[PDB]
Amino acid sequence: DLQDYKAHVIAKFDTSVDLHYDSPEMKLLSDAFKPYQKTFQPHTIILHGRPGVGKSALARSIVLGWAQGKLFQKMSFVIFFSVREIKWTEKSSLAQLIAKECPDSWDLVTKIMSQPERLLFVIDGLDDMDSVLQHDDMTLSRDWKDEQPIYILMYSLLRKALLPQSFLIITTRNTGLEKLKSMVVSPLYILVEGLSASRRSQLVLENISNESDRIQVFHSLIENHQLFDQCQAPSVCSLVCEALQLQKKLGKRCTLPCQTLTGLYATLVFHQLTLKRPSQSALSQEEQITLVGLCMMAAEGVWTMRSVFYDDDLKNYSLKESEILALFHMNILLQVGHNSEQCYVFSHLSLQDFFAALYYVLEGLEEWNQHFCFDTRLLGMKRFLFGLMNKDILKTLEVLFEYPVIPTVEQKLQHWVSLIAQQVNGTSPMDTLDAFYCLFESQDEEFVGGALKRFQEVWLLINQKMDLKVSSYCLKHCQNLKAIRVDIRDLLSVDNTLELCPVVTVQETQCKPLLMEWWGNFCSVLGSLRNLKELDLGDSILSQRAMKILCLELRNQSCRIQKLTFKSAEVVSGLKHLWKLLFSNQNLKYLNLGNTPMKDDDMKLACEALKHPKCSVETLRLDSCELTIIGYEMISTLLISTTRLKCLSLAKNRVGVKSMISLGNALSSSMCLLQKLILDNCGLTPASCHLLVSALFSNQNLTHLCLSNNSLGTEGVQQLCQFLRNPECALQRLILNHCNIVDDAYGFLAMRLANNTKLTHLSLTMNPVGDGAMKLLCEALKEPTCYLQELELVDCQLTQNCCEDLACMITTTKHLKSLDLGNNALGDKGVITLCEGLKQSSSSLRRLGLGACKLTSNCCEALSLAISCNPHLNSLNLVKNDFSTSGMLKLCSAFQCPVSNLGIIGLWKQEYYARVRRQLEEVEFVKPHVVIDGDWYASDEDDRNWWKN
């Protein structure tokens, strides 16, 4: 009886004569049920794709082709299931379903005996069953002829627990694959796509109006991936083209924007209702109820992940097919199915998302509940909801509904956008880009203007042209912005690339690529902002033309940028444009040029530009720029000449003897006016250091000198003390972080610090100074004729033997206000000894660093007593120490005291039990000005990191 069934299935499935053929794409499907590896032969194939492509037509073509030939020959039986046309709440058996599918019931009994090896199941649409499962526990059915709800039967089929060693083909959607991939055993995935990008582009191009705005609107539509990617379905592209043609014919009476999917959908829907109206008028009361019911049903279906809307669901909202059909006269809520029960689905999921988003606008217009008798899936609804805030649409809604329309959700959207701007440790660029894309959908100045008012700092990654356009559109309304950073890794790497998308050019005469003009528009937007004064290029790679455009736009008179940074960008090509820009933008006074190698001509041009009267750069950082002898000669000539330069950095590049003597000759002259000099990680030797200090002996202009990470001898320290001894030295801050200073050099330093003014800071980190030299240092600091204000001993070798000396110094000192003890093994006895003199608050110490000091839970009582009555202390560090629960509780209780005035506390709060976290939260609640962050070194009241930038 197989021939009768084959003839019946041939008669049933015949709707595509010019669409079904032996295409080159179909032999892949036929061959897929073959072993790719000799060991492996798959048994399950999953066809996923966008909603609008022809997956169901493809499955029907498979079933029809098996019934004739050339498609499947080993498969003795093929059964087609359409689950969106049936109800999955009744209790039945697998035999009944097949009997409904197969008119002859006597074939199955002989079928089951030998067929399971050679048999094929085709299931169409198991996308609506993602909600039927309770997700708690499902009982697996093992044999057929079992009276169970059919969803359990499908669950058992998918798990190869009902009819094993059989082949399955499942047609589903991309977003309905989250719960199914765990159920099925090693499937094979086939990705289905619609029409190509060139065909899509041509189809869009024919329909655009071409009245003087064709190019910009065309490019706005085509580059938008959210619209362009989902336009794969022929129905969606047909809708877009029909909307575009309608707008041109409805020229002046249509004011809705045409750059976004929301504007095109509103055009079709709202105009469709107008044709019904004999005259321009409002909706009747009954029709309003129908529209609200449709919107509410769509929204509930979106929330509950349902897309079938059975008959009882329609009666819940008091809907009727006749009313909807006679209200729109358009293809909405198509009816599918063949049995007694009926199912109603939207023509496309985009329409359901549009109506779900529209529900939020009309929910508060009245009391609608009287007449009713009752994260990827939410992207489209969210985009439509953001888009529907355009004021032109709300005017049409007000015309239809007779009342002013002001939705409540607008404030919620604005508040969500505002929450992104104010973050404690910087803003995430991805959320910024998502907010920018969402706000670009509503072509409204008031909404977008009011949403962006609290940013003050933006970090942006750009890797598409649409990113450039949306950022250019949104950044115009950021009137409070003060600092920006852009990362463009690969968009502008290659200088020349000339290609056209179609066979013929989109426009007859372009004369310039699209990328360059959008880049120029972005650069002009940057150059027009008023309050912005810091530009960082991040990790950008730029060619010659791009850098030329950037420089020409920055040359404008409306650009007030003061800081320019290139420490991580490759801009070697556009250095000529940079030099020409240098002396024409007179608001620029800080140039960072790290890591970019400098040649002879580049250095010559840079020095010539800096000598210009029109240059106002005052800080020049030039680290890791490999220099030559002639470069050092030209640097010396620049220093001796007329310049406005005050800070110069030459870190991380070796300096020779001849270059050193030339630089010293430049510095010793009375015509050099340089304030700060940074010379760390250079090639300094004790002889070179001796020569440098000997040359500097006659200088009276340098006030900041950094000599970290070098090698300094005892004679060098003696020469430094000799230079500090004479009057009119005007040296304020000295840094010697890794230079090795040992023995007598500490004694010279103490002799100098015993009676010396004008020296307020001194850093001695990472130096082998023990308790013996600390005796001399504390004795020197005890005298009233010592004006030192800050001392750093982070990694010096210290023990608890000097803690009594430190406590006495703290009690007696009247000028020191900062003391750092970073990696010293003080222990608990030393800390108690120090706290003995700390608790009396005899001095004005305001910053204490006790990190990594090896503190257990024995000194916690003394610490709490010291910090309980100590109003002068303001900052404290306690990281990298071991505290028990009781000690932490004592510390928290000391924190809560009304006498302490601690403002910054360095603790990682994610290392303690729940009780300590609760106490910390209560401490933060009582005192609202306390910051508890582990990054203790990121707080600078005064300029402390002047040599690290």
Partner: protein, 367 residues
């Protein structure tokens, strides 16, 4: 008694808006500053800013960095007692193992709490009653291994194919796995429960050599260029040379050995004893053992940094500790609920996974 209280750690903004929109719907149909975590972008990086330092490192000291804190970003809801975990950074995947199967997860999904796996690989239905013990992932992320109690062999999977399926068997019938290892010359080796270590050719599936020791001496297994290090309950440490196929070293310790590790760069060996004591052993000099630390509870895990400048430990004491390499000083701590049994780290030093009872927690290393 010290019971940590869990909170919804990530609290992103994207979920914040969605949650806010949901309450509006019900609140309509009735009559009838906030701190957000940075998302794990693309499953690769977090896009943050680093912390400040008191000074600047030397010119030759660039890539040698140490962590400062850990931050929780996600929880993977396995539904059984977790035993093993693996991280796979180049392909962005996670493997969690329990006594009844292996679940695979992808890090691309942006969810605060994950409950839907990519796949569920099990072997229990094949036999009457079989339990799993361990699993191992290769260095190039193209093969997976798994061994158990009542299995007929160690199962090999292929991760570079278009489909996920079983590949080989590597026969070892009447034994319990307890250990797995891989080497560069394309062979695999495992140390069973009676002190036996067996080597198979990974391509031909043939046994090459057998190494025999005393009972429970093969709990831990570390391989190198040409040496095999083992150690178990017998409180001894032995070294086997493949060429001569016999022991080379024998050292005594005061307690049982519960873990082992090796530095990627230097020539050190790390030991974890049953009384909380860490030990360092020079693999090349083999001079003497020096103890660095002590704890109250036992130690069940150990692993070095990609640059070999620090390590992390887990145990039965509700805590995860991080130590420095030169001397062994503790850096910080993070508490959990129960005895932590496993953890793993990526190859770029960006993420760390940890599973205590039945959920695997993924942290972010802050430098």
């Amino acid at each position: 008694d010290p019971q940590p209280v869990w909170d919804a750690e990530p609290q992103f903004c994207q979920g914040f808006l969605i949650q806010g929109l949901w309450e509006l719907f019900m609140d309509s149909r009735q009559k009838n500053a906030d701190k957000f975590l940075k998302p794990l972008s693309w499953g690769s990086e977090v896009l943050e800013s680093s912390c400040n330092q008191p000074s600047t490192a030397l010119w030759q000291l660039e890539r040698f960095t140490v962590p400062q804190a850990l931050q929780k970003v996600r929880v993977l809801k396995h539904q059984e007692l977790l035993l093993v975990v693996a991280v796979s950074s180049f392909t962005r995947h996670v493997f969690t193992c329990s006594q009844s199967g292996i679940k695979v997860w992808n890090l691309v999904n942006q969810v605060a709490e994950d409950r839907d796996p990519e796949s569920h690989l099990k072997c229990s239905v094949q036999d009457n009653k079989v339990y799993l013990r361990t699993c191992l992932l290769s260095s190039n992320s193209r093969t997976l291994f798994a061994g158990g109690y009542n299995l007929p062999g160690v199962i090999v999977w292929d991760l570079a194919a278009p489909s996920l399926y079983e590949k080989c068997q590597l026969p070892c019938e009447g034994l319990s796995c307890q250990a797995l290892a891989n080497t560069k010359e394309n062979m695999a080796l495992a140390g069973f429960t009676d002190g036996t270590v067996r080597i198979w050719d990974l391509r031909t599936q043939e046994i090459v050599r057998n190494l025999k020791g005393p009972t429970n001496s093969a709990r831990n297994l570390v391989v190198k260029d040409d040496n095999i290090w083992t150690g178990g309950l017998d409180a001894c440490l032995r070294c086997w040379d493949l060429r001569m196929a016999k022991v080379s070293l024998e050292h005594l310790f005061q307690s049982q050995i519960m873990s082992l590790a090796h530095s990627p760069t230097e020539d050190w060996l790390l030991l974890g004893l049953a009384n909380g004591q860490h030990c360092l052993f020079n693999s090349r000099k083999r001079d003497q053992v020096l103890t660095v630390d002590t704890k109250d509870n036992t130690i069940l895990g150990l692993k070095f940094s990609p640059n070999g400048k620090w390590w992390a430990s887990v145990g039965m004491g509700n805590f995860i500790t991080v130590h420095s390499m030169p001397t062994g000083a503790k850096l910080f701590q993070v508490p959990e609920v129960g005895p932590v049994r496993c953890f793993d780290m990526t190859e770029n030093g960006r993420l760390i996974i940890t599973g205590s009872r039945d959920c695997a927690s993924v942290y972010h290393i802050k430098y």
